[PDB]
Amino acid sequence: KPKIVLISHIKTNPYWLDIKAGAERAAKERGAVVEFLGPTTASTEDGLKLFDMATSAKVSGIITYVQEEGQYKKKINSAMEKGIPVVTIDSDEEDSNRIAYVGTDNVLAGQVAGKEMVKQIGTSGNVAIVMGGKNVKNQKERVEGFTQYIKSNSNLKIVDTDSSDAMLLEAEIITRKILNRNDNINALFCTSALDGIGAARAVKDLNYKDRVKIICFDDLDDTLSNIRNGLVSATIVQKSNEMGYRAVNIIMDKIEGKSSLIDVNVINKSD
Ligand SMILES: O[C@@H]1[C@@H](O)[C@H](O)OC[C@H]1O
């Protein structure tokens, strides 16, 4: 049995458990084993260590999350040179020899969120940002696209940006801190899966629904309920299950000698 290591951002995050589910479905169909790994707290060094161990173990393939630009290139290329195929997932290391990237165009997803934000609150007002790690590659990319969009297409001001490190409780805490130190926030932009849930708890608890609208990421059950009940105005949905499934199929196609980025969708109370 071919063994494929899948290295996640955070092993217990429901987004990554969805990715794992897709990966396991593919592995079942293709007859491979998926070893699903990752740190309990976001850590580039831990990810790289898992990558090193996978490489030393001579596994059949490696699918890896990329937490920081330029930090993965060497190990990816060294693994490719040892004949181990690498796929990146849900954040890319574009300047490497990985055979494929499975995930979103993250700057573009940010632009998409910017357009929805303008649709939801108009062209004037104050926005605060909650990101899942300040120095995390696809978070920075999402903030970059969002910022570019609203800069060119509105008069919206970003008055505060802070980090949850992609944890739910920290998202709640930081969002309360943001609402407390700012006097006229009209909306929150949340860029990782648990951020929107945490932010929603904070706005609900502080009685800011609805003075504060929320645009966030991903379609976790709590987020979809918050869209139903009016707490969240919109969420930007990625195809996480499909990313897992596709990554494993690409690795297996490579091992068996057999031979475009994933669009995002907006979900509203309509949807
Ligand atoms: O990197 C992941 C991101 O794509 C998702 O939106 O939020 C959870 C993170 O682990």
Side chain identity at residue 204, one-letter code:
K
Helix ranges (H only) for the chain are: 14-30, 44-56, 73-81, 106-121, 137-153, 168-181, 193-205, 221-228, 240-255
As a whole number of angstroms, the distance between CA 248 and CA 6 comes to 9
Pick the closest to residue 216 from 76, 85, 113, 141 (CA basis): 113
Tokens of 146: 């969002």
CB of 208 closer than 6 A to ligand 1? no
For 107, the token pair is: 């700057």
The tally of CA atoms less than 13 A away on the side-chain side of residue 80 is: 16
What is the whole-number distance in angstroms between the Cα of residue 258 and the centre of ligand 1? 30
For residue 149 and ligand 1, the question of a CB distance below 6 A is answered with no
Question: From residue 146, how far is each of 3, 9, 69, 94, 227 by CA, in Å?
Answer: 38, 22, 19, 21, 21
Distance CA 152, CA 21 (A): 39
Structure resolution in Å?
A: 2.1
State which ligand 1 atom lies nearest to the alpha carbon of 218: 6
Closest CA to 64 of 90, 39, 82: 90
Residue 15 C-alpha to ligand 1 middle, in angstroms?
A: 7
Largest Cα–Cα distance of the chain, in whole Å? 60
Q: Which residue is associated with the tokens 């008055």?
A: 159
* Ligand 1 pocket residue status of 164, Cβ below 6 Å: no
Taking the C-alpha atoms of residue 49 and residue 38, their distance in angstroms, rounded to an integer, is 10
Atom of ligand 1 nearest to the CA of 192: 7
15 lines ligand 1 (CB under 6 A): yes
CB-based contacts of 188, cutoff 8 Å, min separation 6: 127, 128, 129, 130, 175, 178, 199, 203, 212, 213, 214, 215, 216
The residue with tokens 């609150």 is 121
Helix (H), strand (E), coil (C) string for 9-28: CCCCCHHHHHHHHHHHHHHH
Residues paired with residue 92 on neighbouring β-strands, in sequence order: none
Tell me the three state secondary structure of residue 77.
Answer: helix
Distance 164 CA to ligand 1 centre (A): 12
Q: What is the position in ligand 1's atom list of the atom closest to the CA of 10?
A: 10
